[PDB]
Amino acid sequence: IFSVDKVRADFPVLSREVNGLPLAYLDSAASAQKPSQVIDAEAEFYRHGYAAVHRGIHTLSAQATEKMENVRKRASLFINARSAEELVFVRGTTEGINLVANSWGNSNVRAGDNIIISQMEHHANIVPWQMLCARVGAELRVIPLNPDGTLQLETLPTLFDEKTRLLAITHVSNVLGTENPLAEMITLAHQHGAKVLVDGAQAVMHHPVDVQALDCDFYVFSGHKLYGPTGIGILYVKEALLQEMPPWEGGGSMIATVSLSEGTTWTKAPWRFEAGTPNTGGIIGLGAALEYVSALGLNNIAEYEQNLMHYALSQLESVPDLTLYGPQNRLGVIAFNLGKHHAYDVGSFLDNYGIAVRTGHHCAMPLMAYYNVPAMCRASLAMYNTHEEVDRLVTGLQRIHRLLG
Amino acid sequence: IFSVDKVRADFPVLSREVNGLPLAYLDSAASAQKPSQVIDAEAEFYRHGYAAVHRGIHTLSAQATEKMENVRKRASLFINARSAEELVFVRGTTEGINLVANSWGNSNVRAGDNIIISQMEHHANIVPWQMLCARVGAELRVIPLNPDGTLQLETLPTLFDEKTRLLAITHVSNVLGTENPLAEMITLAHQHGAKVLVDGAQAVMHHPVDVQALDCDFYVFSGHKLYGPTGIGILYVKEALLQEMPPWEGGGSMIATVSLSEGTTWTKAPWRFEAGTPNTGGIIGLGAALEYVSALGLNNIAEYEQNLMHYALSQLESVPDLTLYGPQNRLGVIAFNLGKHHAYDVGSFLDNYGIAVRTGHHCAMPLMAYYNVPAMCRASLAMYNTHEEVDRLVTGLQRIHRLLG
C-alpha cells in the first residue's frame, strides 16, 4: 500500500529544476530531503510556542520542556529501546561516536587493549577510535574485506581475544550498501566480554531496527538522513552502561549542584550528557520526521525501495564499461565507476543532465584504497525516487560513454 | 529611528495568549523569540535548496556549501573578526567553551598552573574549567564579588601571577546585568602572558561587539539568544591560536587523509574543528538573524533598550519589599525577590497573569550563594518589549504583595 505519487507530493524540493531540467535527486545517502510536514512542524513551534526548555516556571517553557521529552520517548519506541532514558540527544552520528569514544572509551580501554573496526567504516567510526588508541595506548584491529564488498568473517577468530574491549561496526555501509550480520557478530563479541557499537546512520531509514533484538550496547543515527532536520541525532546506550558513564561536555543542565569550594556533582543520565540549551527546534522536527516515516511504515518503504533497486541494477547492465562495487543484495546505495573516466567528470556530466549524485571517497578512504580506486560514484535510492529517474540515470550514463568514448 | 510597533510585528509568538491573557514575554535572557524573517529563512532553504554541503559535484550541494560559508563570513563581520576563518561553528556557547577547554586547555595548562574565573560566571564558564583542572592538575582561582554585583577588581594583583594560563570572564552577566571592564582586564591578563576567553552569550544582542578592539583570544555566543535558531553558536579564536590547536571531535570533513596503516592527518582551521554534517539549517537561520539585527542597528536597539530599562527600574520603586540584585547601570536583565516569598511562587503568580519570567538559580549557583539566596526572579528586557509590559509586571508584583501579604 505504497504510492510514490502521494509521497513525492510532500517534498517540495523535488518539483525543482536544475540546469533547466527536472531535478533527479539521487544523493539522499549524503542527506535526505524533508517533507513539508517536517519543515512546518519546526516552523510552527518557532511561531506559536517557542520558549527555553529546562522546565521553567512559566507556561511556554514548561510546554516546550514536555514536547522535547515526548520526542525522546517517541524515538525510544522507533528503535525499540527499553526506555526513553536510554537515548541521548546529539548533533549527529559523528558527535555520538565521539561521546562514547571519550566518556566510555577513556575509562574502559587501558593501554594494551584492542578495538576492532571494519574496513568499510565511515570516517566517523574510525578517527574517533584512532584518537582513543593514541592517548590510551591501545591497539586498533581491522576486519578485512572480500572483493564483493562483504566482511571477511573467517578472520574474526584471530582478531577477537581476551583483551578486545570494543567492536565498532556499521549496520549498513554508506557506499557499498552492504548490510552486516550484526546479530551473530554481537553474540561472538559478547562471549569475549567486549561491547559493541553499531553505526546505523544508513540503516534507520531502510527498514525497522530493534536495538533490543540486536542487543547492541551502543547505537547511533543522524536525523538529517532520516528525512529530518540537521543538527540533531540519537545516541542509544544500554541503561546499565549509561549510568556508569562519566560526563563528556560540562556546563548547565547537566549538573546537580555547582560549588566553587565543594566541587560539582552531576545529574543522572541521559540529561547528564546534555549540557547547555538543546536544539529544541531540531528535536521538534525530528519528532515530525519520526512520525511521518512511521505513518508509511518502514516495511512498506523497505519494499518499494528493494523493488526500485532490483529494477535499477538490471537496467544498469545495458551500460557498457560500468563497474559496480559491493554485493548483489545491496541496500539503498549504488557505487560505480564509468570505464576509466574520473568519477568527478562522470558526476559532472550527470549534474548537467539534472541528476544529483555524489563523487569522491564518500568519507571512506580505507574502502577506496581496498579497490585501488581514488573515488567512485554513488547514486542513492530513497522512497521518493522513481523508475523514470532510474532510466534518466542509465541513459545519461550511456550518453557520457558515447561522448567521452 | 526605532519603532517597537514595527518590530513586534515580525514576531508572531508575541500575539499569543497564555491563561487567556496577552503574553508578556520577559524571559528573552533564557532564549529570545525569533522574527518571521529568521523562521522562513530556514524553512525556505529546506523547501527549495536543501542538499548536503561539503562541496559536492552537483548543484544544490555546491550552492548550499557556498551559502554556509557566506554566513560564516557575515558573522565574522558582525563581531568584527579579522577573517572569517577565525570563526568556528558550534552548537552554542556551552560547546564552544568545552572545545577550548579541551583542544587548547589540555595542551597549554600543565599541573601547577592556575586559571581565573569570576564568581558571577554562568555554569558553562565554570564546570568546563573545573574539569580541565581535575585532569591536568591545575589550580582554579575566582575573582570575588562586591555587594552591588560588580567584580572586586582590587583583588586582581593577588590572583594574576606568572603561572596564570588563562582568564575566563563573562562580557555581561545573565543575572545581574553587569557588564565587566573587559578591555582593561584583557590588557592586564596579557601582561602576564595569560590568554582571555570572553563569554558574550549575553552581550552580543545588547550592543555592538568588536573582538579586535577588545583583543580577546576567545569569544563565544549562542544564536538562540540572538533572535536566531537553536543548535547553532559561534566560537571566535585568534587565527594565530586556532592554527596551533589540535582537533577535539574526530570524523569526516575535518580530515585531510585517513589511512589505517599510515595514520590520519587533519585539515586546517576552522574546518578542522567542524566534524561531520553541519547544522546547515541552523546556520542559514543564524545568517537571517544576523542580517535582521543589523538592519535595525545594534546602536538603535541599544538605545531603546537602555531607555526601557531606566523606565522599568524607576517604576519598580513603587513595589514594596522588592529587593534588586546588581548595579544601577544594569544591562538587559533584572534580578529580584519579593519580600520573603519564594521566587518559585512569585513567578508562579506572574505566569498566571500572563507574564513570562525565570525563577531559580539561572545556572549560576555560586552567585546565588554569594547572596545567601536559594534563587531569584529574572525579568529580561529585549527590543520587542514595551512599557506597558513593564507596568503589567510592576502591577502584578504589587498584587502578589497585597495577596500573599
Cα distance from B137 to chain A (closest Cα, Å)? 14
Q: Are A199 and A209 in contact (CB under 8 A)?
A: no
Write out the three cell numbers for B74. Answer: 557575515
Residue A285 neighbours by CB under 8 Å, 6+ apart: A34, A38, A39, A41, A42, A223, A228, A229, A232
Q: Are B39 and A47 in contact (CB under 8 A)?
A: yes
Do A31 and B51 lie within an 8 Å CB cutoff? yes
Size of interface A-B (CB pairs under 8 A): 288
* Sheet bearing A376-380, strands edge to edge: A322-325, A333-338, A376-380, A358-360
Radius of gyration of chain A (CA): 22
- Closest-CA residue of A relative to B355 is A58
Write out the three cell numbers for A66. Answer: 514536555
Residues B68, B196, single domain; the answer is yes
* Sheet bearing B195-199, strands edge to edge: B87-90, B233-237, B218-222, B195-199, B164-170, B114-118, B139-143
Asked whether residue B226 is assigned to any structural domain, the reply reads yes
Of A269, A296, A323, the one marking the end of a domain is A296
What angle do helix axes B280-296 and B36-48 make, rounded to 10 degrees? Answer: 140
Give the distance, in angstroms, between the CA of residue A347 and the centroid of all CA atoms in the same chain.
23
Q: Are A270 and A86 in contact (CB under 8 A)?
A: yes
Q: Are B379 and B333 in contact (CB under 8 A)?
A: yes
Strands B255-259, B322-325: pairing is: unpaired
- CA dist., res. B95 & res. B242, Å (int): 16
- CA dist., res. A47 & res. A233, Å (int): 23
For B179-215, give the DSSP string: B--HHHHHHHHHTTT-EEEEE-TTTTTTS---HHHHT
At which residue does the C-alpha cell 522507533 appear? A78
Question: How far apart are the two ends of chain B, measured CA to CA in Å?
Answer: 44
Position B40, amino acid: D
Give the distance, in angstroms, between the CA of residue A324 and the centroid of all CA atoms in the same chain.
22
Residues A269, A365, single domain; the answer is no
Q: Are B314 and B68 in contact (CB under 8 A)?
A: no
Do B231 and A369 lie within an 8 Å CB cutoff? no
Which chain B residues have a beta carbon less than 8 Å from that of A363?
251-253
Q: Are A322 and A384 in contact (CB under 8 A)?
A: no
Cα distance from B33 to chain A (closest Cα, Å)? 7
Do A230 and B263 lie within an 8 Å CB cutoff? no
Asked whether residue B199 is assigned to any structural domain, the reply reads yes
- CA dist., res. A84 & res. B242, Å (int): 39
Residues A54, A127, single domain; the answer is yes
Asked whether residue A306 is assigned to any structural domain, the reply reads yes
Q: Are B12 and A47 in contact (CB under 8 A)?
A: yes
Segment holding B266, helix H or strand E: strand B263-266
Which CATH number do you get for residue A141? Answer: 3.40.640.10
In this complex, the residue of A251, A277, A366 whose CB is nearest that of residue B128 is A251
Choosing among B34, B133, B174, B277, which should be mutated to test the A contact, i.e. which has the most A CBs within 10 A?
A: B277
CA distances from A72 to A89, A209, A235, A240 (A): 8, 16, 11, 18
CA distances from B123 to A253, A280, B48, B265, B296 (A): 9, 20, 40, 34, 32
Do B127 and A16 lie within an 8 Å CB cutoff? no
Question: Resolution of the coordinates in A?
Answer: 2.8
Residues A136, A257, single domain; the answer is yes
Which CATH number do you get for residue B350? Answer: 3.90.1150.10
Residues A269, A331, single domain; the answer is no
- Which residues lie across from A86 on neighbouring strands? none
Segment holding B386, helix H or strand E: none
- CA dist., res. B41 & res. B63, Å (int): 15
Residues B96, B236, single domain; the answer is yes
Do A258 and B123 lie within an 8 Å CB cutoff? yes
Among residues B132, B22, B280, the alpha carbon closest in space to that of A224 is found at B280
Choosing among A15, A125, A127, A389, which should be mutated to test the B contact, i.e. which has the most B CBs within 10 A?
A: A127
Cα distance from A303 to chain B (closest Cα, Å)? 25
- CA dist., res. A113 & res. A137, Å (int): 8
Helix (H, G, I), strand (E, B) or coil at B99: helix
Of B296, B320, B336, the one marking the end of a domain is B296
Provide the domain limits for residue A272: 37-296
At which residue does the C-alpha cell 533572535 appear? B227
Q: Quick one: CA dihedral B352, B355, B356, B358, positive or negative?
A: negative
For chain A, what's the residue count? 405
Kindly tell me the burial class for residue B51, based on how many C-beta atoms sit within 10 Å of its own C-beta (0-12, 13-18, 19 or more).
buried
Write out the three cell numbers for A86. Answer: 536510554
Sequence-ordered alpha helix ranges (H) in B225-279? 239-242
Residues B289, B323, single domain; the answer is no
Helix (H, G, I), strand (E, B) or coil at B248: coil
Kindly tell me the burial class for residue B122, based on how many C-beta atoms sit within 10 Å of its own C-beta (0-12, 13-18, 19 or more).
buried
Asked whether residue A327 is assigned to any structural domain, the reply reads yes
Omega cis (within 30) before B278: no
Query: What are the residue numbers of the active site of A?
Result: 363
Write out the three cell numbers for B251. Answer: 570524523
Of A266, A296, A326, the one marking the end of a domain is A296
- CA dist., res. A45 & res. A113, Å (int): 48
- CA dist., res. A201 & res. A205, Å (int): 8
- CA dist., res. A395 & res. A390, Å (int): 9
Cα distance from B280 to chain A (closest Cα, Å)? 6
Asked whether residue B308 is assigned to any structural domain, the reply reads yes
Write out the three cell numbers for A54. Answer: 529546562
Q: Report how many domains make up chain A.
A: 2
Helix (H, G, I), strand (E, B) or coil at B233: strand
- Please give the angle made by the CA atoms of B167, A272 and B88, to the nearest 5 degrees: 45
One-letter-per-residue 3-state SS of chain A: CCCHHHHHCCCHHHHCEECCEECEECCCCCCCCCCHHHHHHHHHHHHHCCCCCCCCCCHHHHHHHHHHHHHHHHHHHHCCCCCHHHEEEECCHHHHHHHHHHHCHHHCCCCCCEEEEECCCCHHHCHHHHHHHHHHCCEEEEECECCCCCECHHHHHHCCCCCEEEEEEECECCCCCCECCHHHHHHHHHCCCCEEEEECCCCCCCCCCCHHHHCCCEEEEEHHHCCCCCCCEEEEECHHHHCCCCCCCCCCCCEEEEECCCEEEECCCCHHHCCCCCCHHHHHHHHHHHHHHHHHCHHHHHHHHHHHHHHHHHHHHHCCCEEEECCCCCCCEEEEEECCECHHHHHHHHHHCCEECEEECCCCHHHHHHCCCCCEEEEECCCCCCHHHHHHHHHHHHHHHHHHC
- Tell me the technique behind this structure: X-ray
Residues B255, B334, single domain; the answer is no
Among residues A131, A137, A197, the alpha carbon closest in space to that of A163 is found at A137
Choosing among A25, A58, A359, A389, which should be mutated to test the B contact, i.e. which has the most B CBs within 10 A?
A: A58
Residues A389, A331, single domain; the answer is yes
Do A18 and B60 lie within an 8 Å CB cutoff? yes
Neighbours of B43 (CB within 10 A): 21
- CA dist., res. A400 & res. A217, Å (int): 46
Strands B195-199, B218-222: pairing is: parallel
Which chain A residues have a beta carbon less than 8 Å from that of B31?
50-52, 277
Residues A28, A150, single domain; the answer is no
Residues A75, A22, single domain; the answer is no
Residues A277, A202, single domain; the answer is yes
Asked whether residue A405 is assigned to any structural domain, the reply reads no
Write out the three cell numbers for A191. Answer: 562471549
Asked whether residue B405 is assigned to any structural domain, the reply reads no
What angle do helix axes B36-48 and A36-48 make, rounded to 10 degrees? Answer: 180
Asked whether residue B277 is assigned to any structural domain, the reply reads yes
At which residue does the C-alpha cell 579564536 appear? B237
